[PDB]
């Protein structure tokens, strides 16, 4: 639900950064909250939290490398769940980095899913090619990127992608 952004121009004052972040990311869904600090450790970064998960995936794919205050932002799925999400809401391998399932045909193909899977630096295994063109086996270096790809097309109007749980 939360995306981690880095490579941000740290000269922007904190309250202005957060307000532009809110504005920019509102186009994909309701942003619940934004965590951004200027400490040495955290400067140039921000966590953007969305109510809907599909919104986070769409944001990630569409704004990857978007010029913001002069620099191309780098977006990724956060490592952990945001405190606000955990409070609003209330297995050991999950989150997993291998999503195998089918329900994604229609002249779909391996260079197609390979470029969609390619979008992610995690691009490791891609199995979509028999007469099928409808069974997708995706091994993504890490679950942030597998989760990024999965969260990006998390409802391919409905495809079925099942992590190797």
């Amino acid at each position: 639900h939360t995306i981690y952004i880095n490579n941000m121009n740290d000269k922007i004052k904190k309250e202005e950064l957060k307000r532009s972040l809110y504005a920019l990311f509102s186009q994909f869904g309701h942003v619940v909250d934004i965590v951004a600090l200027k400490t040495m450790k955290m400067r140039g970064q921000a966590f953007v939290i969305f109510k809907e998960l599909g919104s986070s995936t769409n944001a990630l794919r569409q704004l990857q490398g978007f010029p913001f205050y002069g620099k191309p932002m780098r977006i990724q799925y956060a490592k952990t769940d945001s405190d606000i999400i955990s409070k609003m809401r209330g297995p050991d391998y999950p989150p997993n980095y291998i999503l195998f399932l089918n329900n994604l045909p229609e002249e779909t193909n391996e260079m197609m899913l390979s470029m969609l899977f390619n979008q992610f630096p995690g691009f490791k295994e891609v199995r979509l090619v028999p007469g099928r063109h409808d069974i997708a086996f995706v091994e993504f270096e890490n679950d942030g990127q597998a989760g990024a790809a999965r969260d990006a097309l998390q409802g391919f109007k409905a495809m079925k992608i099942t992590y190797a749980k």
């Binding site: 532009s20 809110y22 504005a23 509102s26 309701h30 619940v32 934004i34």
Partner: protein, 162 residues
């Protein structure tokens, strides 16, 4: 699905992430902005994202409204008396709408406090000199399309259009 006091009265109301009172009008398929009187001027900003509004017009006098998020609508024209109904409008997000001609952005010159403006994903964006035109005609803007309006651009926009 007309905008309504009844619609407005059951709408999610909350304090947003940037600490402002915001009203959630998103995703109702509203076509025309109307009946805002019923909000009673109690909101810092209104989220009108993902609707079908054609014209940014029809507002009552709203003294507290400072932020207008109007993402993914069909805005093709901006009303002429906007400063008279929204005096402190400071941030206007118009991403992914239908403004096509530079001249259609002219009514924003009258919003004296307008400081944050976003018109990305509008056809008008690809028009020659779009950025300089906005800077000269709406000088009160400090951040345009999430980029700082710089002095050199102001001067350059002073030459062209002088």
């Amino acid at each position: 699905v007309k905008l309504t006091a009844e619609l407005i009265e059951q709408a999610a109301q909350y304090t947003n992430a940037v600490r402002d009172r915001e009203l959630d009008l998103r995703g109702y398929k509203i076509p025309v902005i109307e009946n805002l009187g019923a909000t009673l001027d109690q909101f810092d900003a209104i989220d009108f994202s993902d609707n079908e509004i054609r014209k940014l017009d029809g507002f009552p006098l709203l003294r507290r409204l400072k932020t207008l998020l109007v993402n993914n609508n069909r805005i093709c024209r901006i009303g002429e008396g906007l400063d008279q109904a929204l005096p402190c409008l400071t941030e206007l997000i118009l991403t992914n709408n239908s403004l096509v001609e530079l001249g259609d952005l002219d009514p924003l010159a009258s919003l004296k406090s307008l400081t944050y403006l976003s018109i990305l994903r509008n056809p008008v964006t690809n028009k020659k000199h779009y950025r300089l035109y906005v800077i000269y005609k709406v000088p009160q803007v400090r951040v345009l399309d999430f980029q700082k309006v710089k002095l050199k651009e102001r001067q350059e926009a002073e030459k062209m259009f002088k």
